[PDB]
Amino acid sequence: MILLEVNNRIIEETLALKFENAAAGNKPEAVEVTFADFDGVLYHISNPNGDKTKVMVSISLKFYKELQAHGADELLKRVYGSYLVNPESGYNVSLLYDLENLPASKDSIVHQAGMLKRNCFASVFEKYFQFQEEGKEGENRAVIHYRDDETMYVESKKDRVTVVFSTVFKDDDDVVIGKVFMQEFKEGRRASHTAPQVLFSHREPPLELKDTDAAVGDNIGYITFVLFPRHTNASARDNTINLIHTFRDYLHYHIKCSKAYIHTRMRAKTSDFLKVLNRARPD
Amino acid sequence: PAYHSSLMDPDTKLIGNMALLPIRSQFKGPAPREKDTDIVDEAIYYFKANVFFKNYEIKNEADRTLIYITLYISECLKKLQKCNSKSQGEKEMYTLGITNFPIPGEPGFPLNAIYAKPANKQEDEVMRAYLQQLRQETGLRLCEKVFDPQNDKPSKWWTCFVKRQFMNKSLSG
Amino acid sequence: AYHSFLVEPISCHAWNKDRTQIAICPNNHEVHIYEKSGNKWVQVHELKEHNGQVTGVDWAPDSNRIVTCGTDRNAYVWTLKGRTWKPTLVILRINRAARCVRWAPNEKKFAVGSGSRVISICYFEQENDWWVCKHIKKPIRSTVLSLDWHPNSVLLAAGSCDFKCRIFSAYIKEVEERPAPTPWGSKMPFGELMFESSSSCGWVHGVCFSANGSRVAWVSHDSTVCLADADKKMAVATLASETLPLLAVTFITESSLVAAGHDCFPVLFTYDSAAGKLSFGGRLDVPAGLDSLHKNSVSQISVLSGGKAKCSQFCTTGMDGGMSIWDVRSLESALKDLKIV
Amino acid sequence: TATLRPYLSAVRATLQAALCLENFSSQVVERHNKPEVEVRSSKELLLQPVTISRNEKEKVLIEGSINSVRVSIAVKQADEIEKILCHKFMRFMMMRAENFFILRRKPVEGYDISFLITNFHTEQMYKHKLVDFVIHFMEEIDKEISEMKLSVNARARIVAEEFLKNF
Amino acid sequence: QAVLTLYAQGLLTGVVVDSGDGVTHICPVYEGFSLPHLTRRLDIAGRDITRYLIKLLLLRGYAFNHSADFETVRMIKEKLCYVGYNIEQEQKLALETTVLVESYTLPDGRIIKVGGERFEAPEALFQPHLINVEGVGVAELLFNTIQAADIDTRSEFYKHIVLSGGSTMYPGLPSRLERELKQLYLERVLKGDVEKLSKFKIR
Amino acid sequence: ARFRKVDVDEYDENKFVDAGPDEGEVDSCLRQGNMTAALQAALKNPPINTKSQAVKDRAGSIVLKVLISFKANDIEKAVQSLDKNGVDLLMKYIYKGFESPSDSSAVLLQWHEKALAAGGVGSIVRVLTARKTV
Amino acid sequence: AGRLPACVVDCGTGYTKLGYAGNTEPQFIIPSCIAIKEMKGVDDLDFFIGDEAIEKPTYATKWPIRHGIVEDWDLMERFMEQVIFKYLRAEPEDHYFLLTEPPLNTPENREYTAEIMFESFNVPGLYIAVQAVLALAASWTSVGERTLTGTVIDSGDGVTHVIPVAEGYVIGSCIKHIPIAGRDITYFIQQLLRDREVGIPPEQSLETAKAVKERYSYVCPDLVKEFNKYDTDGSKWIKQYTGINAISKKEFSIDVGYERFLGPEIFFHPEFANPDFTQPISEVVDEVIQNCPIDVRRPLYKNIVLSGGSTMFRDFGRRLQRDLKRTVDARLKLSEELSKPKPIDVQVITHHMQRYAVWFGGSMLASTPEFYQVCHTKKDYEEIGPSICRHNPVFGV
Numbered sequence A: 001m002i003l004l005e006v007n008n009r010i011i012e013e014t015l016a017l018k019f020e021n022a023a024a025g026n027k028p029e030a031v032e033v034t035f036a037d038f039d040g041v042l043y044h045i046s047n048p049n050g051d052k053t054k055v056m057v058s059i060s061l062k063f064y065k066e067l068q069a070h071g072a073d074e075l076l077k078r079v080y081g082s083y084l085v086n087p088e089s090g091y092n093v094s095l096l097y098d099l100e101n102l103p104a105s106k107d108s109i110v111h112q113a114g115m116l117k118r119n120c121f122a123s124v125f126e127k128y129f130q131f132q133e134e135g136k137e138g139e140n141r142a143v144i145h146y147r148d149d150e151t152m153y154v155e156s157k158k159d160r161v162t163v164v165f166s167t168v169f170k171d172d173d174d175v176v177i178g179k180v181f182m183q184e185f186k187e188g189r190r191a192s193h194t195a196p197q198v199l200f201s202h203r204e205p206p207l208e209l210k211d212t213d214a215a216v217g218d219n220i221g222y223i224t225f226v227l228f229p230r231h232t233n234a235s236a237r238d239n240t241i242n243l244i245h246t247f248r249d250y251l252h253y254h255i256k257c258s259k260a261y262i263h264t265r266m267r268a269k270t271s272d273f274l275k276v277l278n279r280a281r282p283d
Numbered sequence B: 001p002a003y004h005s006s007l008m009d010p011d012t013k014l015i016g017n018m019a020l021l022p023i024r025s026q027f028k029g030p031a032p033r034e035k036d037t038d039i040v041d042e043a044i045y046y047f048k049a050n051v052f053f054k055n056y057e058i059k060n061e062a063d064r065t066l067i068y069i070t071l072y073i074s075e076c077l078k079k080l081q082k083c084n085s086k087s088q089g090e091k092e093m094y095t096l097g098i099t100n101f102p103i104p105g106e107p108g109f110p111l112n113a114i115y116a117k118p119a120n121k122q123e124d125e126v127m128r129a130y131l132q133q134l135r136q137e138t139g140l141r142l143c144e145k146v147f148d149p150q151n152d153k154p155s156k157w158w159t160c161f162v163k164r165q166f167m168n169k170s171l172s173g
Numbered sequence C: 001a002y003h004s005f006l007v008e009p010i011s012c013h014a015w016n017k018d019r020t021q022i023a024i025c026p027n028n029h030e031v032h033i034y035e036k037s038g039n040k041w042v043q044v045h046e047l048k049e050h051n052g053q054v055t056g057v058d059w060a061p062d063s064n065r066i067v068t069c070g071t072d073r074n075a076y077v078w079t080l081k082g083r084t085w086k087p088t089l090v091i092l093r094i095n096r097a098a099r100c101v102r103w104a105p106n107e108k109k110f111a112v113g114s115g116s117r118v119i120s121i122c123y124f125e126q127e128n129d130w131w132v133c134k135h136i137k138k139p140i141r142s143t144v145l146s147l148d149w150h151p152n153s154v155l156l157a158a159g160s161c162d163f164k165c166r167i168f169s170a171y172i173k174e175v176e177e178r179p180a181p182t183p184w185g186s187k188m189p190f191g192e193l194m195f196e197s198s199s200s201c202g203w204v205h206g207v208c209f210s211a212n213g214s215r216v217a218w219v220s221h222d223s224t225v226c227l228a229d230a231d232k233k234m235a236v237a238t239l240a241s242e243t244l245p246l247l248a249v250t251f252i253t254e255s256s257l258v259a260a261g262h263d264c265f266p267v268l269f270t271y272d273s274a275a276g277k278l279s280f281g282g283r284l285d286v287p288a289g290l291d292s293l294h295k296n297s298v299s300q301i302s303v304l305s306g307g308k309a310k311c312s313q314f315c316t317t318g319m320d321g322g323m324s325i326w327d328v329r330s331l332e333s334a335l336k337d338l339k340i341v
Numbered sequence D: 001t002a003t004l005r006p007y008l009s010a011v012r013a014t015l016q017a018a019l020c021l022e023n024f025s026s027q028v029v030e031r032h033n034k035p036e037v038e039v040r041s042s043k044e045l046l047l048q049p050v051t052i053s054r055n056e057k058e059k060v061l062i063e064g065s066i067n068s069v070r071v072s073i074a075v076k077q078a079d080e081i082e083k084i085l086c087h088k089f090m091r092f093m094m095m096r097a098e099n100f101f102i103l104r105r106k107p108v109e110g111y112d113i114s115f116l117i118t119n120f121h122t123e124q125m126y127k128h129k130l131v132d133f134v135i136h137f138m139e140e141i142d143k144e145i146s147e148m149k150l151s152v153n154a155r156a157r158i159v160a161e162e163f164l165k166n167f
Numbered sequence E: 001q002a003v004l005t006l007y008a009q010g011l012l013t014g015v016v017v018d019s020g021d022g023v024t025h026i027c028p029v030y031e032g033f034s035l036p037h038l039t040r041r042l043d044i045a046g047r048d049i050t051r052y053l054i055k056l057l058l059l060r061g062y063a064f065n066h067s068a069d070f071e072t073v074r075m076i077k078e079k080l081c082y083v084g085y086n087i088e089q090e091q092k093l094a095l096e097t098t099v100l101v102e103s104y105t106l107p108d109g110r111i112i113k114v115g116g117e118r119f120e121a122p123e124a125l126f127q128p129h130l131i132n133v134e135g136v137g138v139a140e141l142l143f144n145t146i147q148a149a150d151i152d153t154r155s156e157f158y159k160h161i162v163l164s165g166g167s168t169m170y171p172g173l174p175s176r177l178e179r180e181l182k183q184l185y186l187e188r189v190l191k192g193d194v195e196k197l198s199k200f201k202i203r
Numbered sequence F: 001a002r003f004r005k006v007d008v009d010e011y012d013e014n015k016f017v018d019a020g021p022d023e024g025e026v027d028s029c030l031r032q033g034n035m036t037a038a039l040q041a042a043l044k045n046p047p048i049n050t051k052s053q054a055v056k057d058r059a060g061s062i063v064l065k066v067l068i069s070f071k072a073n074d075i076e077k078a079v080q081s082l083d084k085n086g087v088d089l090l091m092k093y094i095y096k097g098f099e100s101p102s103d104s105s106a107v108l109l110q111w112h113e114k115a116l117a118a119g120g121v122g123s124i125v126r127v128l129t130a131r132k133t134v
Numbered sequence G: 001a002g003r004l005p006a007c008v009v010d011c012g013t014g015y016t017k018l019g020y021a022g023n024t025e026p027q028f029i030i031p032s033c034i035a036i037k038e039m040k041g042v043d044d045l046d047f048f049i050g051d052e053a054i055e056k057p058t059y060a061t062k063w064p065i066r067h068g069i070v071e072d073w074d075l076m077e078r079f080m081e082q083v084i085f086k087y088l089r090a091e092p093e094d095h096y097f098l099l100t101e102p103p104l105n106t107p108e109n110r111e112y113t114a115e116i117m118f119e120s121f122n123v124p125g126l127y128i129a130v131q132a133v134l135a136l137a138a139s140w141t142s143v144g145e146r147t148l149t150g151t152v153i154d155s156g157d158g159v160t161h162v163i164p165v166a167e168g169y170v171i172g173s174c175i176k177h178i179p180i181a182g183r184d185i186t187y188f189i190q191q192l193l194r195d196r197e198v199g200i201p202p203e204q205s206l207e208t209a210k211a212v213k214e215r216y217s218y219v220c221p222d223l224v225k226e227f228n229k230y231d232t233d234g235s236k237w238i239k240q241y242t243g244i245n246a247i248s249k250k251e252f253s254i255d256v257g258y259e260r261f262l263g264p265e266i267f268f269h270p271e272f273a274n275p276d277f278t279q280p281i282s283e284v285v286d287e288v289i290q291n292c293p294i295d296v297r298r299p300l301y302k303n304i305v306l307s308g309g310s311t312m313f314r315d316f317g318r319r320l321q322r323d324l325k326r327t328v329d330a331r332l333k334l335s336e337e338l339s340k341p342k343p344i345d346v347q348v349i350t351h352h353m354q355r356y357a358v359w360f361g362g363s364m365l366a367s368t369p370e371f372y373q374v375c376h377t378k379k380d381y382e383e384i385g386p387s388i389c390r391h392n393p394v395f396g397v
């Protein structure tokens, strides 16, 4: 698995099992589940008020207000319509499904529920993609603190939109490995010239953010994706969004998998060494 | 563990070291007269359970008679298995029961280390006669069970034990 | 002529008078004695008493007694009682490991070098029926690694980790008398320091006296072999080896030295009394991945027959656990360039 | 290379000279046996420390003693990625030091990895082969570090394109 | 006990350090019999060490049961444990090298590995607080006894310290004491270095 | 837990207790291009007993300075003109030289090669066992 | 406890249970298997785990965990990659982790696990809990006085373990194994079905067995009596089962009978299926407790807990308790008849969360304040070293 998936399997699997038993006419099992998603996201699935014929899927993001300030609410409404309801205390968005009132095909709703995290993020990208399109320049930049110590900056220009991630590498050696990856991203166009351009600043933030309270530290790193109209237009938007919003996790997911691999190499090398070292015995 | 006989009395007669227990049966034999529960009954009851066991602790000489009947039931099943009518197998049984199966002391009898040998020609005669009587009654009663009230139908619920061997022994091996 | 008694080291060895049996310690608190049967070796005895590894074993020929010393700091003299060896404890009065031991020629006393930086000269008092001992301390500054007695049973040569080969006097008047004047000196009271090498290098792994004991040689860790001549004002002749350190050394004549060590094979050194110069004429082991009999360092080497005067056969045990028997004349024929003395 | 074989050759020769040990009980503690180069509590038992340097970065320290030798290596680390790969690799092995018997749990200050070869080792194993192992080891860690370096770059390019190709 | 001990030990006036599988004593003995008034006790011996090893081996990843596996651990202690001489020095060996690691086959076949806990367990004898005990430890305890005694008879006691008891068979123990005693005499009796003349041996 | 902070072993009466070449002469030989002589000149009166590091280091540099001044194919010839005592001292200086790399290692390794062929591994063992060394 | 629940992963030899702390059931119960191509580029990442890796065509299925212990680290490590980033979708740097280990796992293995969790995934905290202890904790769900001293009977598909626990620590020297478990039962039920039924596709002989075993099997009090009922009123005991032929899709159907009770029976009468082993499971448990210290023996009898799939069988505990009492009672008899020792209180607790007792106890313990207290942190790992993961303080009582 190279790219990270977008949907949330626990959401989708949970819902499905309930929807099945529902159709089968069985008596509803109570359900109470707590789980997370990448970047401090916490979910909750439960029977509101204990009514086991209702299933609520709530999501909580510490930086919701930020996305709310960029179309979040409006977008979520379009996508979920009547499933979207008053948010459960402690969470920002709640979906409610009446087990006795499901569509003919449950795949649309199940798939869409599994994309709650992603849809909460979608609006901020659409809003600025739409700015570029209308040539509305000079618009203030969106600042999303998706993590406690990580920030995403979105901005639109004459013919391009920029996404800048301020990521952190806890492990001092992860910075070094990250550098190898970022290097390959900067040259990523030598194999796809139409693809987005990628920039990387070891850790002085890009100049557009020097007067800002932007972070500056040995373990900090700024990535800039230059998305072009061919990526931000109503034809690419969704897919582009599905990738871009999973980047930071993609990068870190691969720094760890590399270390895992270096490990298998070290197991093999150490194993050999031990053999040579032991053929040194008179048997 | 395994199921043991409870027919052993203080005044029970011995043929060898096997207990000469009573038996409701028409066939003739040195079998005493009998309670509507004979040793052949007790064996047919416990079979399906007992059969699985590989170890069996001899408690009374009555057990030895129980073990014998049991081993024989397996022989019958090996027969009733390839039959097409209670009438037919009912015959193959009378016959089988008449065959000269080995006895304690002879090579061919499994368990010669648990079954005493007839101390003389008289006992040899009685024992042979008893074992045979036992085989015949046993084979007959077994036929009612083995066949479903729908003839030509050896109940697979009896046939399925054909390959099982109580204490991993055989009167035919 | 190699034989493997095991794959672990033979810490030390000792042979009886008839060279019929050999005592060995296989990295153990024990001492196994093997005897020959046809052309096979058979273990006949097992001496278990040391609570530490045996680091030295010497067999007194005439009295046929075995003496052993271990890291447990003890030393038991073993006596043969019909079909068994019985150990007798001998308080060395030391607090570190015993490193080596050797009976004296007259078999009336034995010495034990140790990490207590002293040499324990032991003897028996038939009076109170037991083994006593006096210490030769000064000027020893470190662990004594090897000992060898002078033929007169009084003078004693010692090599220690303080880079010195010294000759003392283990004169114990309670068992012998006024030693006869030696070129090594007239005055020989107990522990008197008769001679001392001058180099301040290489631990003296092994020392050896000549047949008449007027010459003493020793091998050090600096990969050099020396021989001090008492008929030449104790002048010392040195030969720096081009190879690894020697651990053991013995005279095979009055001017021929045979040694082995970490290179894993025996070599020949010859002394030119005239020029007072040592020379290398060695390498007798002429043909794991080694072209030598022993597959690990050779740590001990004793004379098997012919004395140090005109040795005919000599033995070598080593860290590989092997025991080799070398025939001097045999060697002289396999190598035409050979020159004993 | 041009200078590699010569470097190793010098190192091998010094190892051949250093691995000449014997069992030596302690002069300081009753019934104790310790690797002198480690406890260093009896200076006449220690040999002169020596170094074989290939250049100002790659060098080997060889500390001998009557019953043990400590060998510390300075591994070639050209850039950041090699520096961290090497560091992770040595750590990996040190953490398994009990399986190695000649490996030191920690490096001697100033070095990347270290060996502690005792007389027990040279008795259990052919010393001429222990000498081979150390040279084999030096040559092989450099290869592994390069192999890892390539692996990482190899995957980074595929990871970058797999993500850029989808926009 | 120490009476007969130091006594027909062929010496009749020294000090007996007696530690068995349960309790330690320091028995002074003057020309003839002993002087009870000085004799002190240490509530730390055999079992305690074995006890302590168990705890140490637990932290290593070996969960032995205090009751069930006590004898097993006692055997281990007897075989692998010892007294470190220079604790600072020993801890370094345990942390930087693996020369102290030894294997031990348990009664059921499994093979555990014991290293640094070999000298840590018996270290209790010198640092009681390690096993939650109040005291100064066998060495310091001894030193105080002799010092707190007839100065004339002191020199004699020191040159006549005898060891007795299982928990005194620990390799290095003698050396450790001597070093410890030489540290207390150097501090609590002098301060200046004129030790060459401060002779005393434990045999 | 205070009395143990002192290393009594320091004062235990049982503890073990154990000018330079002529610069101008060397420089004179160097400047004239007579290398094989500068070697012999430097391998002279080594500060084997000096208690100062500066003094020894002084000599070490003088010798290293000559070694470096050599040309690849000119070493073997030089080394073969020395007696074993000479080759031993040489080897001792080569190891000293390994502690100051500089631009010297590449060439000092060529010296080790040649020295090893002449003096054998024994010349190295004697570097290790030296108590008084340059 | 922050706002994010800890990650709880229980790696069984056959199944791996995973989810977040506090949840009552695991969020994923998947096969402990990984499929790989059988390296350069990103070939190491080209794999699948759990169900998705059982039928993979161009892929080879592997099983990292054998007899509870990790046999292949390279593979166990990759397995975790997906467990974390594909299923749990958890940012490993943000969640503490609780993993489990079979009894008799070596201290080295823990360091190997810790090396992976800290050096590869960068977890903030880690805790390695021993399965048996978790099981004891899970039974508190039944008992109003929580205790971590008891006897655990773990049985899955490999071998069954009788593991005594005292004050939170497994009494290693007293564990005992039994050559009977899920497998031996299937292979047995498989033979019962072969001698009798037809229609079962050879290539689905075991498929059928394991199925029947799990859907109908149970423990009965008396064999003859049970056999009787079946032969008497075969209508109220002979169940039907229908499986679809892989080929032709011919929906075959068989009759299930005796095996319903003869399966779980081999536990108590091993000799039925196994020639080399005959001890009844109630005897082994008795033998075990008898070896543990006297002062702990009764508490062990009073708290025998279950864990494993093969402990699912209806009445398992009931039959085990009867059997055990008969043995322990009869022993106290020969003493009164030889000289009257207080009667021993033998108990066998069975609860609802048994299907995943271990993962359940782990889930409950990992959501308590104390869990964070007795957990090893990344800072301690980096400063003190992986040695700290050798020992994991017991907590919870």
Ligand SMILES: Nc1ncnc2c1ncn2[C@@H]1O[C@H](COP(=O)(O)OP(=O)(O)O)[C@@H](O)[C@H]1O
Residues within 6 Å of the ligand: E019, E020, E021, E022, E023, E045, E046, E047, E050, E074, E077, E078, E079, E165, E166, E167, E168, E169, E170
């Ligand atoms: N070689 C040894 N090293 C350390 N301790 C030992 C050794 N041998 C025995 N012990 C311990 O010494 C104690 C037994 O001493 P002993 O005097 O026999 O007991 P007690 O005097 O109380 O009857 C036990 O703790 C035993 O484990």
Ligand SMILES: Nc1ncnc2c1ncn2[C@@H]1O[C@H](COP(=O)(O)OP(=O)(O)O)[C@@H](O)[C@H]1O
Residues within 6 Å of the ligand: G012, G013, G014, G015, G155, G156, G157, G158, G181, G182, G183, G210, G213, G214, G308, G309, G310, G311, G312, G313
């Ligand atoms: N309800 C059940 N009754 C009896 N056995 C079951 C039941 N459910 C599962 N099993 C058996 O549990 C065993 C589990 O074996 P294993 O693969 O090791 O899983 P785990 O690692 O969780 O113990 C299998 O034999 C499975 O058939």
Ligand SMILES: [Ca+2]
Residues within 6 Å of the ligand: G010, G011, G012, G013, G131, G358
């Ligand atoms: Ca499990």
